[PDB]
Structures are given as structure tokens and as C-alpha cells.
PDB file of all heavy atoms in Angstrom:
ATOM      1  N   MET T  62      10.388  -8.947  -5.063  1.00  0.00           N
ATOM      2  CA  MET T  62       9.641  -7.838  -4.438  1.00  0.00           C
ATOM      3  C   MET T  62       9.708  -6.585  -5.288  1.00  0.00           C
ATOM      4  O   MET T  62       8.684  -5.914  -5.462  1.00  0.00           O
ATOM      5  CB  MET T  62      10.205  -7.564  -3.038  1.00  0.00           C
ATOM      6  CG  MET T  62       9.232  -6.844  -2.135  1.00  0.00           C
ATOM      7  SD  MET T  62       9.907  -6.548  -0.496  1.00  0.00           S
ATOM      8  CE  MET T  62       8.820  -7.606   0.488  1.00  0.00           C
ATOM      9  N   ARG T  63      10.870  -6.277  -5.850  1.00  0.00           N
ATOM     10  CA  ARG T  63      11.065  -5.066  -6.632  1.00  0.00           C
ATOM     11  C   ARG T  63      10.233  -5.184  -7.935  1.00  0.00           C
ATOM     12  O   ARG T  63       9.407  -4.281  -8.266  1.00  0.00           O
ATOM     13  CB  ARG T  63      12.517  -4.896  -6.989  1.00  0.00           C
ATOM     14  CG  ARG T  63      13.478  -5.252  -5.880  1.00  0.00           C
ATOM     15  CD  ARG T  63      14.847  -4.558  -6.047  1.00  0.00           C
ATOM     16  NE  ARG T  63      15.737  -5.360  -6.792  1.00  0.00           N
ATOM     17  CZ  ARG T  63      15.814  -5.366  -8.114  1.00  0.00           C
ATOM     18  NH1 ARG T  63      14.943  -4.641  -8.807  1.00  0.00           N
ATOM     19  NH2 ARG T  63      16.678  -6.117  -8.757  1.00  0.00           N
ATOM     20  N   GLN T  64      10.402  -6.294  -8.703  1.00  0.00           N
ATOM     21  CA  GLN T  64       9.682  -6.484  -9.923  1.00  0.00           C
ATOM     22  C   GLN T  64       8.199  -6.186  -9.726  1.00  0.00           C
ATOM     23  O   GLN T  64       7.560  -5.586 -10.564  1.00  0.00           O
ATOM     24  CB  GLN T  64       9.890  -7.919 -10.417  1.00  0.00           C
ATOM     25  CG  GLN T  64       9.548  -8.130 -11.894  1.00  0.00           C
ATOM     26  CD  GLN T  64       8.124  -7.806 -12.205  1.00  0.00           C
ATOM     27  OE1 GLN T  64       7.809  -6.725 -12.775  1.00  0.00           O
ATOM     28  NE2 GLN T  64       7.259  -8.698 -11.866  1.00  0.00           N
ATOM     29  N   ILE T  65       7.653  -6.691  -8.643  1.00  0.00           N
ATOM     30  CA  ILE T  65       6.215  -6.495  -8.338  1.00  0.00           C
ATOM     31  C   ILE T  65       6.047  -5.350  -7.358  1.00  0.00           C
ATOM     32  O   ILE T  65       7.025  -4.834  -6.808  1.00  0.00           O
ATOM     33  CB  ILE T  65       5.608  -7.761  -7.756  1.00  0.00           C
ATOM     34  CG1 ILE T  65       6.340  -8.219  -6.502  1.00  0.00           C
ATOM     35  CG2 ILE T  65       5.611  -8.881  -8.818  1.00  0.00           C
ATOM     36  CD1 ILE T  65       5.502  -9.051  -5.578  1.00  0.00           C
ATOM     37  N   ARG T  66       4.784  -4.968  -7.114  1.00  0.00           N
ATOM     38  CA  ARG T  66       4.477  -3.927  -6.215  1.00  0.00           C
ATOM     39  C   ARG T  66       3.141  -4.181  -5.457  1.00  0.00           C
ATOM     40  O   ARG T  66       2.255  -4.794  -6.025  1.00  0.00           O
ATOM     41  CB  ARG T  66       4.339  -2.580  -6.947  1.00  0.00           C
ATOM     42  CG  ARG T  66       5.674  -1.892  -7.108  1.00  0.00           C
ATOM     43  CD  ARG T  66       6.223  -1.336  -5.775  1.00  0.00           C
ATOM     44  NE  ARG T  66       5.746  -0.020  -5.493  1.00  0.00           N
ATOM     45  CZ  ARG T  66       4.652   0.270  -4.846  1.00  0.00           C
ATOM     46  NH1 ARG T  66       3.877  -0.705  -4.454  1.00  0.00           N
ATOM     47  NH2 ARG T  66       4.275   1.511  -4.614  1.00  0.00           N
ATOM     48  N   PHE T  67       3.057  -3.778  -4.244  1.00  0.00           N
ATOM     49  CA  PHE T  67       1.876  -3.954  -3.427  1.00  0.00           C
ATOM     50  C   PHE T  67       1.115  -2.662  -3.211  1.00  0.00           C
ATOM     51  O   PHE T  67       1.678  -1.571  -3.345  1.00  0.00           O
ATOM     52  CB  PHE T  67       2.236  -4.560  -2.061  1.00  0.00           C
ATOM     53  CG  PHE T  67       2.791  -5.953  -2.160  1.00  0.00           C
ATOM     54  CD1 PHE T  67       4.135  -6.134  -2.365  1.00  0.00           C
ATOM     55  CD2 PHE T  67       1.974  -7.086  -2.087  1.00  0.00           C
ATOM     56  CE1 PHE T  67       4.686  -7.437  -2.438  1.00  0.00           C
ATOM     57  CE2 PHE T  67       2.491  -8.349  -2.171  1.00  0.00           C
ATOM     58  CZ  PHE T  67       3.852  -8.549  -2.362  1.00  0.00           C
ATOM     59  N   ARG T  68      -0.159  -2.767  -2.879  1.00  0.00           N
ATOM     60  CA  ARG T  68      -1.028  -1.597  -2.690  1.00  0.00           C
ATOM     61  C   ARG T  68      -2.290  -1.947  -1.877  1.00  0.00           C
ATOM     62  O   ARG T  68      -2.708  -3.114  -1.898  1.00  0.00           O
ATOM     63  CB  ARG T  68      -1.393  -0.952  -4.023  1.00  0.00           C
ATOM     64  CG  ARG T  68      -0.301  -0.128  -4.630  1.00  0.00           C
ATOM     65  CD  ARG T  68      -0.845   0.774  -5.779  1.00  0.00           C
ATOM     66  NE  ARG T  68       0.230   1.195  -6.616  1.00  0.00           N
ATOM     67  CZ  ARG T  68       0.015   1.845  -7.821  1.00  0.00           C
ATOM     68  NH1 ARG T  68      -1.245   2.008  -8.240  1.00  0.00           N
ATOM     69  NH2 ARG T  68       1.033   2.184  -8.583  1.00  0.00           N
ATOM     70  N   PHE T  69      -2.832  -0.951  -1.197  1.00  0.00           N
ATOM     71  CA  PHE T  69      -4.035  -1.166  -0.398  1.00  0.00           C
ATOM     72  C   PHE T  69      -4.967   0.022  -0.511  1.00  0.00           C
ATOM     73  O   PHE T  69      -4.663   1.099  -0.018  1.00  0.00           O
ATOM     74  CB  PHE T  69      -3.666  -1.408   1.089  1.00  0.00           C
ATOM     75  CG  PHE T  69      -4.841  -1.598   1.972  1.00  0.00           C
ATOM     76  CD1 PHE T  69      -5.472  -2.866   2.042  1.00  0.00           C
ATOM     77  CD2 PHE T  69      -5.378  -0.583   2.713  1.00  0.00           C
ATOM     78  CE1 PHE T  69      -6.558  -3.080   2.849  1.00  0.00           C
ATOM     79  CE2 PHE T  69      -6.475  -0.786   3.530  1.00  0.00           C
ATOM     80  CZ  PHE T  69      -7.075  -2.003   3.597  1.00  0.00           C
ATOM     81  N   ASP T  70      -6.099  -0.203  -1.158  1.00  0.00           N
ATOM     82  CA  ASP T  70      -7.132   0.856  -1.337  1.00  0.00           C
ATOM     83  C   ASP T  70      -6.610   1.948  -2.295  1.00  0.00           C
ATOM     84  O   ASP T  70      -7.003   3.114  -2.223  1.00  0.00           O
ATOM     85  CB  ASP T  70      -7.477   1.480   0.016  1.00  0.00           C
ATOM     86  CG  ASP T  70      -8.802   2.200  -0.026  1.00  0.00           C
ATOM     87  OD1 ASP T  70      -9.777   1.629  -0.569  1.00  0.00           O
ATOM     88  OD2 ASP T  70      -8.880   3.304   0.501  1.00  0.00           O
ATOM     89  N   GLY T  71      -5.648   1.554  -3.141  1.00  0.00           N
ATOM     90  CA  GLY T  71      -5.113   2.498  -4.086  1.00  0.00           C
ATOM     91  C   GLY T  71      -4.031   3.379  -3.490  1.00  0.00           C
ATOM     92  O   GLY T  71      -3.851   4.561  -3.834  1.00  0.00           O
ATOM     93  N   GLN T  72      -3.243   2.756  -2.580  1.00  0.00           N
ATOM     94  CA  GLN T  72      -2.163   3.470  -1.881  1.00  0.00           C
ATOM     95  C   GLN T  72      -0.946   2.575  -1.733  1.00  0.00           C
ATOM     96  O   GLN T  72      -1.044   1.374  -1.522  1.00  0.00           O
ATOM     97  CB  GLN T  72      -2.611   4.017  -0.550  1.00  0.00           C
ATOM     98  CG  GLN T  72      -3.645   5.063  -0.637  1.00  0.00           C
ATOM     99  CD  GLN T  72      -4.185   5.526   0.726  1.00  0.00           C
ATOM    100  OE1 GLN T  72      -4.525   4.703   1.535  1.00  0.00           O
ATOM    101  NE2 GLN T  72      -4.177   6.857   0.983  1.00  0.00           N
ATOM    102  N   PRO T  73       0.254   3.179  -1.809  1.00  0.00           N
ATOM    103  CA  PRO T  73       1.554   2.420  -1.709  1.00  0.00           C
ATOM    104  C   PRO T  73       1.758   1.970  -0.274  1.00  0.00           C
ATOM    105  O   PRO T  73       1.909   2.783   0.619  1.00  0.00           O
ATOM    106  CB  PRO T  73       2.563   3.451  -2.109  1.00  0.00           C
ATOM    107  CG  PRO T  73       1.952   4.817  -1.826  1.00  0.00           C
ATOM    108  CD  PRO T  73       0.463   4.617  -2.120  1.00  0.00           C
ATOM    109  N   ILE T  74       1.861   0.671  -0.101  1.00  0.00           N
ATOM    110  CA  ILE T  74       2.114   0.113   1.251  1.00  0.00           C
ATOM    111  C   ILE T  74       3.570  -0.387   1.343  1.00  0.00           C
ATOM    112  O   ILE T  74       4.160  -0.882   0.412  1.00  0.00           O
ATOM    113  CB  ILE T  74       1.149  -1.081   1.491  1.00  0.00           C
ATOM    114  CG1 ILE T  74       1.072  -2.014   0.280  1.00  0.00           C
ATOM    115  CG2 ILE T  74      -0.223  -0.581   1.879  1.00  0.00           C
ATOM    116  CD1 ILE T  74       0.742  -3.454   0.597  1.00  0.00           C
ATOM    117  N   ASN T  75       4.113  -0.261   2.561  1.00  0.00           N
ATOM    118  CA  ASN T  75       5.452  -0.692   2.850  1.00  0.00           C
ATOM    119  C   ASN T  75       5.487  -1.895   3.798  1.00  0.00           C
ATOM    120  O   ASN T  75       4.775  -1.931   4.810  1.00  0.00           O
ATOM    121  CB  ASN T  75       6.217   0.484   3.460  1.00  0.00           C
ATOM    122  CG  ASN T  75       5.903   1.812   2.804  1.00  0.00           C
ATOM    123  OD1 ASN T  75       5.513   2.750   3.506  1.00  0.00           O
ATOM    124  ND2 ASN T  75       6.039   1.851   1.482  1.00  0.00           N
ATOM    125  N   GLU T  76       6.288  -2.920   3.458  1.00  0.00           N
ATOM    126  CA  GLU T  76       6.369  -4.071   4.272  1.00  0.00           C
ATOM    127  C   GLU T  76       6.436  -3.747   5.757  1.00  0.00           C
ATOM    128  O   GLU T  76       5.893  -4.484   6.607  1.00  0.00           O
ATOM    129  CB  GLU T  76       7.657  -4.858   3.896  1.00  0.00           C
ATOM    130  CG  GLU T  76       8.866  -4.005   3.600  1.00  0.00           C
ATOM    131  CD  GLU T  76      10.137  -4.816   3.319  1.00  0.00           C
ATOM    132  OE1 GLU T  76      10.227  -5.984   3.734  1.00  0.00           O
ATOM    133  OE2 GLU T  76      10.991  -4.249   2.628  1.00  0.00           O
ATOM    134  N   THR T  77       7.062  -2.612   6.065  1.00  0.00           N
ATOM    135  CA  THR T  77       7.177  -2.172   7.450  1.00  0.00           C
ATOM    136  C   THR T  77       5.819  -1.917   8.074  1.00  0.00           C
ATOM    137  O   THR T  77       5.531  -2.347   9.190  1.00  0.00           O
ATOM    138  CB  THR T  77       7.995  -0.848   7.569  1.00  0.00           C
ATOM    139  OG1 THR T  77       7.378   0.197   6.786  1.00  0.00           O
ATOM    140  CG2 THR T  77       9.409  -1.066   7.050  1.00  0.00           C
ATOM    141  N   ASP T  78       4.894  -1.272   7.326  1.00  0.00           N
ATOM    142  CA  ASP T  78       3.572  -1.019   7.767  1.00  0.00           C
ATOM    143  C   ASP T  78       2.831  -2.269   8.170  1.00  0.00           C
ATOM    144  O   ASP T  78       3.155  -3.395   7.678  1.00  0.00           O
ATOM    145  CB  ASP T  78       2.802  -0.304   6.703  1.00  0.00           C
ATOM    146  CG  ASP T  78       2.947   1.243   6.759  1.00  0.00           C
ATOM    147  OD1 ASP T  78       4.056   1.699   6.332  1.00  0.00           O
ATOM    148  OD2 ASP T  78       2.036   1.961   7.265  1.00  0.00           O
ATOM    149  N   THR T  79       1.863  -2.119   8.985  1.00  0.00           N
ATOM    150  CA  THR T  79       1.059  -3.322   9.481  1.00  0.00           C
ATOM    151  C   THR T  79      -0.359  -3.217   8.987  1.00  0.00           C
ATOM    152  O   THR T  79      -0.903  -2.171   8.602  1.00  0.00           O
ATOM    153  CB  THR T  79       1.054  -3.435  11.005  1.00  0.00           C
ATOM    154  OG1 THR T  79       1.106  -2.123  11.579  1.00  0.00           O
ATOM    155  CG2 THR T  79       2.214  -4.272  11.484  1.00  0.00           C
ATOM    156  N   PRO T  80      -1.072  -4.384   8.940  1.00  0.00           N
ATOM    157  CA  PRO T  80      -2.443  -4.496   8.495  1.00  0.00           C
ATOM    158  C   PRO T  80      -3.417  -3.832   9.448  1.00  0.00           C
ATOM    159  O   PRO T  80      -4.539  -3.572   9.095  1.00  0.00           O
ATOM    160  CB  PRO T  80      -2.678  -6.029   8.411  1.00  0.00           C
ATOM    161  CG  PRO T  80      -1.713  -6.589   9.439  1.00  0.00           C
ATOM    162  CD  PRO T  80      -0.511  -5.667   9.404  1.00  0.00           C
ATOM    163  N   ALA T  81      -2.950  -3.491  10.659  1.00  0.00           N
ATOM    164  CA  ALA T  81      -3.775  -2.890  11.651  1.00  0.00           C
ATOM    165  C   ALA T  81      -3.736  -1.369  11.495  1.00  0.00           C
ATOM    166  O   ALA T  81      -4.713  -0.715  11.845  1.00  0.00           O
ATOM    167  CB  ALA T  81      -3.297  -3.286  13.038  1.00  0.00           C
ATOM    168  N   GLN T  82      -2.667  -0.829  10.964  1.00  0.00           N
ATOM    169  CA  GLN T  82      -2.516   0.591  10.774  1.00  0.00           C
ATOM    170  C   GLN T  82      -3.423   1.053   9.653  1.00  0.00           C
ATOM    171  O   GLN T  82      -3.979   2.168   9.689  1.00  0.00           O
ATOM    172  CB  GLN T  82      -1.048   0.931  10.395  1.00  0.00           C
ATOM    173  CG  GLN T  82      -0.726   2.412  10.613  1.00  0.00           C
ATOM    174  CD  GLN T  82      -0.697   2.865  12.030  1.00  0.00           C
ATOM    175  OE1 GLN T  82      -1.689   3.208  12.597  1.00  0.00           O
ATOM    176  NE2 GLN T  82       0.468   2.829  12.610  1.00  0.00           N
ATOM    177  N   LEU T  83      -3.540   0.233   8.574  1.00  0.00           N
ATOM    178  CA  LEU T  83      -4.403   0.568   7.461  1.00  0.00           C
ATOM    179  C   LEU T  83      -5.863   0.150   7.705  1.00  0.00           C
ATOM    180  O   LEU T  83      -6.702   0.303   6.823  1.00  0.00           O
ATOM    181  CB  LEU T  83      -3.878  -0.088   6.176  1.00  0.00           C
ATOM    182  CG  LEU T  83      -2.371   0.138   5.891  1.00  0.00           C
ATOM    183  CD1 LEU T  83      -1.914  -0.796   4.817  1.00  0.00           C
ATOM    184  CD2 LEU T  83      -2.142   1.643   5.465  1.00  0.00           C
ATOM    185  N   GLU T  84      -6.118  -0.399   8.864  1.00  0.00           N
ATOM    186  CA  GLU T  84      -7.459  -0.830   9.216  1.00  0.00           C
ATOM    187  C   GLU T  84      -7.881  -1.958   8.356  1.00  0.00           C
ATOM    188  O   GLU T  84      -9.049  -2.034   7.915  1.00  0.00           O
ATOM    189  CB  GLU T  84      -8.457   0.349   9.117  1.00  0.00           C
ATOM    190  CG  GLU T  84      -8.512   1.226  10.379  1.00  0.00           C
ATOM    191  CD  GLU T  84      -9.451   2.301  10.230  1.00  0.00           C
ATOM    192  OE1 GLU T  84      -9.176   3.297   9.476  1.00  0.00           O
ATOM    193  OE2 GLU T  84     -10.511   2.301  10.966  1.00  0.00           O
ATOM    194  N   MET T  85      -6.956  -2.848   8.005  1.00  0.00           N
ATOM    195  CA  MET T  85      -7.268  -4.024   7.115  1.00  0.00           C
ATOM    196  C   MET T  85      -8.283  -4.948   7.766  1.00  0.00           C
ATOM    197  O   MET T  85      -8.032  -5.612   8.715  1.00  0.00           O
ATOM    198  CB  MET T  85      -5.978  -4.793   6.857  1.00  0.00           C
ATOM    199  CG  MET T  85      -4.946  -4.019   6.032  1.00  0.00           C
ATOM    200  SD  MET T  85      -3.667  -5.119   5.372  1.00  0.00           S
ATOM    201  CE  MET T  85      -3.812  -4.710   3.659  1.00  0.00           C
ATOM    202  N   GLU T  86      -9.489  -4.858   7.234  1.00  0.00           N
ATOM    203  CA  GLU T  86     -10.619  -5.701   7.746  1.00  0.00           C
ATOM    204  C   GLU T  86     -10.475  -7.110   7.294  1.00  0.00           C
ATOM    205  O   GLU T  86      -9.532  -7.474   6.532  1.00  0.00           O
ATOM    206  CB  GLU T  86     -11.945  -5.114   7.287  1.00  0.00           C
ATOM    207  CG  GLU T  86     -12.220  -3.739   7.796  1.00  0.00           C
ATOM    208  CD  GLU T  86     -11.695  -2.628   6.876  1.00  0.00           C
ATOM    209  OE1 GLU T  86     -10.955  -3.012   5.930  1.00  0.00           O
ATOM    210  OE2 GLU T  86     -12.079  -1.489   7.011  1.00  0.00           O
ATOM    211  N   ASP T  87     -11.401  -7.951   7.691  1.00  0.00           N
ATOM    212  CA  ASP T  87     -11.371  -9.412   7.318  1.00  0.00           C
ATOM    213  C   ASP T  87     -11.932  -9.593   5.932  1.00  0.00           C
ATOM    214  O   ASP T  87     -12.862  -8.854   5.496  1.00  0.00           O
ATOM    215  CB  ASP T  87     -12.205 -10.202   8.311  1.00  0.00           C
ATOM    216  CG  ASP T  87     -11.505 -10.399   9.636  1.00  0.00           C
ATOM    217  OD1 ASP T  87     -11.605  -9.533  10.534  1.00  0.00           O
ATOM    218  OD2 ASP T  87     -10.834 -11.429   9.786  1.00  0.00           O
ATOM    219  N   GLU T  88     -11.383 -10.558   5.179  1.00  0.00           N
ATOM    220  CA  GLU T  88     -11.793 -10.833   3.851  1.00  0.00           C
ATOM    221  C   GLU T  88     -11.568  -9.628   2.888  1.00  0.00           C
ATOM    222  O   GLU T  88     -12.365  -9.287   2.061  1.00  0.00           O
ATOM    223  CB  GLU T  88     -13.272 -11.238   3.837  1.00  0.00           C
ATOM    224  CG  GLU T  88     -13.580 -12.519   4.518  1.00  0.00           C
ATOM    225  CD  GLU T  88     -13.557 -12.371   6.012  1.00  0.00           C
ATOM    226  OE1 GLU T  88     -14.354 -11.570   6.571  1.00  0.00           O
ATOM    227  OE2 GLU T  88     -12.730 -13.070   6.695  1.00  0.00           O
ATOM    228  N   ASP T  89     -10.396  -8.987   3.119  1.00  0.00           N
ATOM    229  CA  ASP T  89     -10.027  -7.837   2.291  1.00  0.00           C
ATOM    230  C   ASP T  89      -9.367  -8.210   0.995  1.00  0.00           C
ATOM    231  O   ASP T  89      -9.262  -9.419   0.756  1.00  0.00           O
ATOM    232  CB  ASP T  89      -9.127  -6.877   3.068  1.00  0.00           C
ATOM    233  CG  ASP T  89      -9.287  -5.421   2.649  1.00  0.00           C
ATOM    234  OD1 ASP T  89      -8.627  -5.048   1.701  1.00  0.00           O
ATOM    235  OD2 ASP T  89     -10.113  -4.707   3.326  1.00  0.00           O
ATOM    236  N   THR T  90      -8.916  -7.293   0.272  1.00  0.00           N
ATOM    237  CA  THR T  90      -8.237  -7.532  -1.005  1.00  0.00           C
ATOM    238  C   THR T  90      -7.033  -6.614  -1.189  1.00  0.00           C
ATOM    239  O   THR T  90      -7.105  -5.417  -1.004  1.00  0.00           O
ATOM    240  CB  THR T  90      -9.222  -7.359  -2.208  1.00  0.00           C
ATOM    241  OG1 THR T  90     -10.407  -8.109  -1.991  1.00  0.00           O
ATOM    242  CG2 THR T  90      -8.533  -7.793  -3.508  1.00  0.00           C
ATOM    243  N   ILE T  91      -5.896  -7.226  -1.616  1.00  0.00           N
ATOM    244  CA  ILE T  91      -4.690  -6.453  -1.825  1.00  0.00           C
ATOM    245  C   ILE T  91      -4.477  -6.140  -3.349  1.00  0.00           C
ATOM    246  O   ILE T  91      -5.078  -6.740  -4.175  1.00  0.00           O
ATOM    247  CB  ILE T  91      -3.450  -7.225  -1.299  1.00  0.00           C
ATOM    248  CG1 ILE T  91      -3.676  -7.711   0.091  1.00  0.00           C
ATOM    249  CG2 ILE T  91      -2.220  -6.297  -1.356  1.00  0.00           C
ATOM    250  CD1 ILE T  91      -2.482  -8.401   0.723  1.00  0.00           C
ATOM    251  N   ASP T  92      -3.715  -5.069  -3.586  1.00  0.00           N
ATOM    252  CA  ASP T  92      -3.452  -4.676  -4.956  1.00  0.00           C
ATOM    253  C   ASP T  92      -2.013  -4.970  -5.329  1.00  0.00           C
ATOM    254  O   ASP T  92      -1.061  -4.462  -4.726  1.00  0.00           O
ATOM    255  CB  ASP T  92      -3.746  -3.184  -5.125  1.00  0.00           C
ATOM    256  CG  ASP T  92      -5.188  -2.898  -5.279  1.00  0.00           C
ATOM    257  OD1 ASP T  92      -5.962  -3.106  -4.320  1.00  0.00           O
ATOM    258  OD2 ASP T  92      -5.638  -2.483  -6.366  1.00  0.00           O
ATOM    259  N   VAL T  93      -1.845  -5.796  -6.366  1.00  0.00           N
ATOM    260  CA  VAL T  93      -0.531  -6.152  -6.884  1.00  0.00           C
ATOM    261  C   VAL T  93      -0.506  -6.329  -8.379  1.00  0.00           C
ATOM    262  O   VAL T  93      -1.544  -6.618  -8.995  1.00  0.00           O
ATOM    263  CB  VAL T  93       0.009  -7.470  -6.219  1.00  0.00           C
ATOM    264  CG1 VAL T  93       1.384  -7.774  -6.689  1.00  0.00           C
ATOM    265  CG2 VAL T  93      -0.049  -7.336  -4.692  1.00  0.00           C
ATOM    266  N   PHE T  94       0.687  -6.128  -8.958  1.00  0.00           N
ATOM    267  CA  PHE T  94       0.816  -6.202 -10.426  1.00  0.00           C
ATOM    268  C   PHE T  94       1.810  -7.348 -10.780  1.00  0.00           C
ATOM    269  O   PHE T  94       3.007  -7.201 -10.528  1.00  0.00           O
ATOM    270  CB  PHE T  94       1.300  -4.899 -11.015  1.00  0.00           C
ATOM    271  CG  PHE T  94       0.446  -3.740 -10.597  1.00  0.00           C
ATOM    272  CD1 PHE T  94       0.539  -3.245  -9.269  1.00  0.00           C
ATOM    273  CD2 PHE T  94      -0.382  -3.100 -11.501  1.00  0.00           C
ATOM    274  CE1 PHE T  94      -0.258  -2.172  -8.900  1.00  0.00           C
ATOM    275  CE2 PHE T  94      -1.167  -1.998 -11.105  1.00  0.00           C
ATOM    276  CZ  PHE T  94      -1.072  -1.554  -9.835  1.00  0.00           C
ATOM    277  N   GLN T  95       1.303  -8.449 -11.331  1.00  0.00           N
ATOM    278  CA  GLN T  95       2.165  -9.567 -11.730  1.00  0.00           C
ATOM    279  C   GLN T  95       2.591  -9.447 -13.140  1.00  0.00           C
ATOM    280  O   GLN T  95       1.822  -9.735 -14.114  1.00  0.00           O
ATOM    281  CB  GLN T  95       1.425 -10.876 -11.481  1.00  0.00           C
ATOM    282  CG  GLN T  95       1.579 -11.440 -10.107  1.00  0.00           C
ATOM    283  CD  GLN T  95       1.364 -12.989 -10.036  1.00  0.00           C
ATOM    284  OE1 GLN T  95       1.517 -13.653 -11.043  1.00  0.00           O
ATOM    285  NE2 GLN T  95       1.034 -13.457  -8.861  1.00  0.00           N
ATOM    286  N   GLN T  96       3.826  -9.075 -13.384  1.00  0.00           N
ATOM    287  CA  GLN T  96       4.354  -8.914 -14.753  1.00  0.00           C
ATOM    288  C   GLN T  96       4.924 -10.269 -15.235  1.00  0.00           C
ATOM    289  O   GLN T  96       5.487 -11.052 -14.490  1.00  0.00           O
ATOM    290  CB  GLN T  96       5.411  -7.846 -14.764  1.00  0.00           C
ATOM    291  CG  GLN T  96       4.895  -6.503 -15.054  1.00  0.00           C
ATOM    292  CD  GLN T  96       6.026  -5.474 -15.223  1.00  0.00           C
ATOM    293  OE1 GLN T  96       7.121  -5.763 -15.716  1.00  0.00           O
ATOM    294  NE2 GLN T  96       5.782  -4.194 -14.867  1.00  0.00           N
ATOM    295  N   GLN T  97       4.759 -10.489 -16.582  1.00  0.00           N
ATOM    296  CA  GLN T  97       5.213 -11.732 -17.166  1.00  0.00           C
ATOM    297  C   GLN T  97       6.729 -11.615 -17.569  1.00  0.00           C
ATOM    298  O   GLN T  97       7.010 -11.042 -18.590  1.00  0.00           O
ATOM    299  CB  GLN T  97       4.395 -12.090 -18.392  1.00  0.00           C
ATOM    300  CG  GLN T  97       2.954 -12.388 -18.060  1.00  0.00           C
ATOM    301  CD  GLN T  97       2.063 -12.467 -19.268  1.00  0.00           C
ATOM    302  OE1 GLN T  97       1.161 -11.716 -19.516  1.00  0.00           O
ATOM    303  NE2 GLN T  97       2.368 -13.499 -20.105  1.00  0.00           N
ATOM    304  N   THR T  98       7.580 -12.132 -16.711  1.00  0.00           N
ATOM    305  CA  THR T  98       9.063 -12.075 -16.998  1.00  0.00           C
ATOM    306  C   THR T  98       9.658 -13.447 -16.801  1.00  0.00           C
ATOM    307  O   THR T  98      10.143 -13.767 -15.697  1.00  0.00           O
ATOM    308  CB  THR T  98       9.735 -11.032 -16.077  1.00  0.00           C
ATOM    309  OG1 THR T  98       9.347 -11.285 -14.706  1.00  0.00           O
ATOM    310  CG2 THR T  98       9.329  -9.607 -16.487  1.00  0.00           C
ATOM    311  N   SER T  99       9.722 -14.231 -17.858  1.00  0.00           N
ATOM    312  CA  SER T  99      10.291 -15.560 -17.824  1.00  0.00           C
ATOM    313  C   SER T  99      11.752 -15.481 -17.411  1.00  0.00           C
ATOM    314  O   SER T  99      12.451 -14.493 -17.642  1.00  0.00           O
ATOM    315  CB  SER T  99      10.186 -16.244 -19.176  1.00  0.00           C
ATOM    316  OG  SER T  99      11.112 -15.733 -20.083  1.00  0.00           O
ATOM    317  N   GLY T 100      12.305 -16.553 -16.823  1.00  0.00           N
ATOM    318  CA  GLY T 100      13.669 -16.598 -16.417  1.00  0.00           C
ATOM    319  C   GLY T 100      14.503 -17.623 -17.178  1.00  0.00           C
ATOM    320  O   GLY T 100      13.991 -18.710 -17.523  1.00  0.00           O
ATOM    321  N   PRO T 101      15.761 -17.340 -17.392  1.00  0.00           N
ATOM    322  CA  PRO T 101      16.680 -18.256 -18.137  1.00  0.00           C
ATOM    323  C   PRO T 101      17.054 -19.442 -17.338  1.00  0.00           C
ATOM    324  O   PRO T 101      17.100 -20.581 -17.833  1.00  0.00           O
ATOM    325  CB  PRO T 101      17.917 -17.361 -18.380  1.00  0.00           C
ATOM    326  CG  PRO T 101      17.905 -16.325 -17.280  1.00  0.00           C
ATOM    327  CD  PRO T 101      16.448 -16.068 -17.004  1.00  0.00           C
ATOM    328  N   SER T 102      17.283 -19.257 -16.035  1.00  0.00           N
ATOM    329  CA  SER T 102      17.618 -20.382 -15.165  1.00  0.00           C
ATOM    330  C   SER T 102      16.394 -20.989 -14.532  1.00  0.00           C
ATOM    331  O   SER T 102      15.317 -20.328 -14.417  1.00  0.00           O
ATOM    332  CB  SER T 102      18.553 -19.906 -14.015  1.00  0.00           C
ATOM    333  OG  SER T 102      18.769 -20.909 -13.059  1.00  0.00           O
ATOM    334  N   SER T 103      16.483 -22.284 -14.189  1.00  0.00           N
ATOM    335  CA  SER T 103      15.341 -23.003 -13.566  1.00  0.00           C
ATOM    336  C   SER T 103      15.670 -23.428 -12.141  1.00  0.00           C
ATOM    337  O   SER T 103      16.832 -23.629 -11.802  1.00  0.00           O
ATOM    338  CB  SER T 103      15.004 -24.174 -14.415  1.00  0.00           C
ATOM    339  OG  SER T 103      15.971 -25.207 -14.370  1.00  0.00           O
TER     340      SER T 103
END
């Protein structure tokens, strides 16, 4: 969770917050950054 980050409409969202508070409509899109960080252990 730390390595990555979430966002909605260009704003920082908190797991605590709900999709109803941000008026998350149907067929929406979330903002996240997937960094390439390989791991030593499998």
C-alpha cells in the first residue's frame, strides 16, 4: 500500500473514505502509480 498510491479525480484518497463520499459514479476510473520494484524473495 505504501509503495503505491491511490487517487480520485486528481486528489489523495484515504482507505477510510468511501466511494459514496467522493460521488464515485458507475464505470469510473481510479488513479494509481505502479512502480517497478522486483523482490529478492519469491
